[PDB]
Design a protein around this ligand. Structure first.
Ligand SMILES: COC(=O)CCCNC(=O)c1cc(S(N)(=O)=O)c(Cl)cc1SC1CCCCC1
Ligand SMILES: COC(=O)CCCNC(=O)c1cc(S(N)(=O)=O)c(Cl)cc1SC1CCCCC1
Ligand SMILES: [Zn+2]
Ligand SMILES: [Zn+2]
Lengths: 260, 260
């Protein structure tokens, strides 16, 4: 149906998913010429992010990414509407070219990128209904670079063995999702954009934190090598690598920054 | 019909031009992880590039770029077949964002890009026939940065006001096309890719010179303000700006370098 490689790749998404060729597409290059300081961009509060260690949360390989389901009582405070969590997932490159972030900064890819997807729960009953509606979604984006081992990211990565193939599922004990966020979360880029995957609805309020997090070389290699896009019994297995969209044109538009 | 902006822009080309969603697409980002030095990449020789100043060559606005028709006596010596010139054209950005090269280097756009299109004249009777055939085309790409006034590029730019609208044609006296090339032409990037416009046939042997040339801010502003994608009488005129494709996924390709 859709892929990041070959005939069903990103240049063909618009055939079945017309919004992928429409307005307000993400991701984009965040570069000095288009940044504008906005003193109105106050710090977000992360509420209910400390997930009950007594709850288990579904981890899925959906053939596009690895996705952790999140509970709706987890939310962002600070925007006009409350935005409630639905899921998080990641984007990455491959061991030969370990630069698979979606957003770039001054033309540079980061190793990987985490998305924590939220929906406008003040206006909409669920993320599906919100996804194609005004003010529907808000995503927190964390840029990931290689560095020190990260025990918080290992709370997800330690389970990748159990979701190797498309359709496979595992359970993750609740942990503090705020541990996945970088230093100085008050420092971020903000713009109106889209889902970076089909159906590419232009309904996302993007918050890209200024500061990256670090995971070890072994953690990054595990993420790049652990998963397949294909079902376990597929006779032509496809490694899940390079699951990021190319940057989109962004002309006559600003990205607002919470930092000078 | 196709454009670089809005509904008929590059994310939609594959709807009408299936190769635009196929493999081996251009342009690409030239970055260290995908470069490989290849000592077999010997210097190209540019034969019959010194066009007589007493002859004249047809400049055309084709609604996508400004193109100069070249004589088939003009050719590249050094490849495994003779490649004869057919045309040169450019890609550029806009007055407020003069960063419209197609290829990028470590994620940075240059101001503009020159393409000198050649076809395999050993095998094919013309460029159109060569264009959908194995080994059919060879393009020389020159990266253009904002710098000093360039008298050689001005031999083209001085005629822009005669080809303002789609379908307009003007004659340019011959000059030495080698003057459009940079210093140290022996140093280049080489890879297999495609037309960067529809129909995006994956039939181009790319040579991108390592070193950029300079043209002035005033030359870029002329190029960025002179031309229209539309006919002179079109009631919905469209400025010919930002006529570059976004960089493409590598699809496991390497880029070979003639320089270590
Ligand atoms: C058939 O496959 C799909 O439509 C979506 C699959 C993968 N996409 C997501 O998981 C996804 C990604 C983003 S991103 N990369 O922009 O942060 C976002 Cl914002 C949302 C979703 S899932 C969303 C899709 C529409 C219905 C609600 C759930
Ligand atoms: C839908 O087709 C067109 O009208 C093409 C118009 C613009 N494209 C080109 O002129 C063109 C561009 C490149 S690039 N930007 O990759 O260097 C190349 Cl390699 C070839 C062509 S035109 C093609 C036409 C067939 C004979 C000559 C080559
Ligand atoms: Zn995402
Ligand atoms: Zn071109």
């Amino acid at each position: 149906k859709w892929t990041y490689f070959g005939p069903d790749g990103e240049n063909s998404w618009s055939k079945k998913y017309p919004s992928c060729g429409g307005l307000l597409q993400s991701p984009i290059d965040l570069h000095s010429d288009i940044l504008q300081y906005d003193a109105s961009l106050t710090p977000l509060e992360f509420q209910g992010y400390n997930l009950s260690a007594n709850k288990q949360f579904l981890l899925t390989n959906n053939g596009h990414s690895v996705k952790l389901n999140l509970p709706s009582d987890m939310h962002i405070q600070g925007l006009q509407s409350r935005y409630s969590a639905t899921q998080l997932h990641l984007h990455w490159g491959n061991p030969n070219d370990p630069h698979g972030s979606e957003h770039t900064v001054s033309g540079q890819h980061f190793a990987a990128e985490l998305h924590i997807v939220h929906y406008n729960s003040d206006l909409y009953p669920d993320a599906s209904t919100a996804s194609n509606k005004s003010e529907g979604l808000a995503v927190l984006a964390v840029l990931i670079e290689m560095g020190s081992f990260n025990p918080s990211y290992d709370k997800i990565f330690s389970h990748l063995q159990h979701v190797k193939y498309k359709g496979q599922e595992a359970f993750v004990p609740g942990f503090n999702i705020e541990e996945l966020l970088p230093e100085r979360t008050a420092e971020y880029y903000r713009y109106r954009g889209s889902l970076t995957t089909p159906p590419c609805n232009p309904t996302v309020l993007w918050t890209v934190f200024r500061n990256p997090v670090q995971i070890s070389q072994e953690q990054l290699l595990a993420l790049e090598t652990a998963l397949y896009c294909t079902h376990m019994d597929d006779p032509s297995p496809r490694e899940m690598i390079n699951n990021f969209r190319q940057v989109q044109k962004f002309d006559e538009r600003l990205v607002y920054t919470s930092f000078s």
